[PDB]
Amino acid sequence: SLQNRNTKNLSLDI
Amino acid sequence: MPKRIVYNISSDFQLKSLLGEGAYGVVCSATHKPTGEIVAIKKIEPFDKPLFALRTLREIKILKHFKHENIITIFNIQRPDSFENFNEVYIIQELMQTDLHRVISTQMLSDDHIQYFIYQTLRAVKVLHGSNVIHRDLKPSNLLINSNCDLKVCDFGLARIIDEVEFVATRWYRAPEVMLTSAKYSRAMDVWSCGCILAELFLRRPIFPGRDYRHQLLLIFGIIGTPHSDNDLRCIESPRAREYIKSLPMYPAAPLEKMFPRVNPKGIDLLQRMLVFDPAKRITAKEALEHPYLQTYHDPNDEPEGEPIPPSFFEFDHYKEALTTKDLKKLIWNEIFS
Numbered sequence A: 001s002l003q004n005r006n007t008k009n010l011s012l013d014i
Numbered sequence B: 001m002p003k004r005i006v007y008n009i010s011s012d013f014q015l016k017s018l019l020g021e022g023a024y025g026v027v028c029s030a031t032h033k034p035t036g037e038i039v040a041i042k043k044i045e046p047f048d049k050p051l052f053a054l055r056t057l058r059e060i061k062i063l064k065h066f067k068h069e070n071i072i073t074i075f076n077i078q079r080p081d082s083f084e085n086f087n088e089v090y091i092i093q094e095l096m097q098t099d100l101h102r103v104i105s106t107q108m109l110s111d112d113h114i115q116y117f118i119y120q121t122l123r124a125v126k127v128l129h130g131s132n133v134i135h136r137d138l139k140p141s142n143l144l145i146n147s148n149c150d151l152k153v154c155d156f157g158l159a160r161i162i163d164e165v166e167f168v169a170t171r172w173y174r175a176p177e178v179m180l181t182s183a184k185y186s187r188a189m190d191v192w193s194c195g196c197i198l199a200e201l202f203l204r205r206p207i208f209p210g211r212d213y214r215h216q217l218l219l220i221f222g223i224i225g226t227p228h229s230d231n232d233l234r235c236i237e238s239p240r241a242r243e244y245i246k247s248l249p250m251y252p253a254a255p256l257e258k259m260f261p262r263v264n265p266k267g268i269d270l271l272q273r274m275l276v277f278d279p280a281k282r283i284t285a286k287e288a289l290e291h292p293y294l295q296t297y298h299d300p301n302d303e304p305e306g307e308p309i310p311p312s313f314f315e316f317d318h319y320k321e322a323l324t325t326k327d328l329k330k331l332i333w334n335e336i337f338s
């Protein structure tokens, strides 16, 4: 996973 | 879940929802009862025409080959109970919540989201190009997305290894050189697709929705400009194509900043570097990761370059006589039990 790079905690409500 | 969908897999599995249905593949989510894990299962009937078996074999070897955060993870392949009773392939993979096409059509992405989504796409493409593999069918519906915004490329059946009747990649994403000149697969075509994908993220609709070949070219050139000079018409060598290009209205490069008034200038910059006519001048995947627009996520040390795959990895594609369905069945069996 690349979450450790999602420096801005971007999300999508699905 | 539609009563018409039938999967000959272990009964430890229980179909949940139908996620994709096409003449080639059918994708359903499913619960593996004993572990409670929910997974994605892609079903393929590959033995009615070599063509299907070939795609299947290519998709399998590619998936088993990579271990990258941006390439969909394969957990396993259902094992048939007998060679005789082997008629469908069931690829079991990590379950994702949707595809980018669905996201574009139902969500307003911030510029952050676009930056991150395209960044991942490019990162996947780099590792592919570095192993000398080209996807050939990159489009939003083949980019899987999770709510935390992870993105993974899927659908590797049309992949090819670079070297010195068929399924066709959606034309809205095909590079102009493929449509024209007899194209020897190149890394530039995938970047062109990424380019169409980024444009679509900004536009929230496909940038080149052509109804056919002609219209497709008329739309593309209406944006990037009609190539006029012979230095410009180099890449193309087939006369009729030169001629066809010359019979086109002479369009100037359309002013993108005026097209995407509210799009990040840096995003448009990167965009224009991808949608270029001459494949040799088109920006590469690596280069694109280095572009200012992706500065928030770029890191020269966490961008796998891959390792070369030789042409014989897909040997079965280069035989004098075409392989039979039985030959292909063996090859797939071999991949399933290895």
Ligand SMILES: Nc1ncnc2c1ncn2[C@@H]1O[C@H](COP(=O)(O)OP(=O)(O)O)[C@@H](O)[C@H]1O
Pocket (backbone or CB within 6 Å): B019, B020, B021, B022, B024, B025, B026, B027, B040, B042, B072, B093, B094, B095, B096, B097, B098, B099, B141, B142, B144, B154, B155
């Ligand atoms: N691992 C997965 N998780 C969730 N959905 C998936 C997954 N793989 C495929 N899908 C869904 O199935 C659709 C088609 O899958 P794809 O692998 O591209 O096969 P096809 O050859 O039919 O295009 C995708 O657009 C996506 O919505």
Ligand SMILES: [Mg+2]
Pocket (backbone or CB within 6 Å): B141, B142, B155
């Ligand atoms: Mg697909």
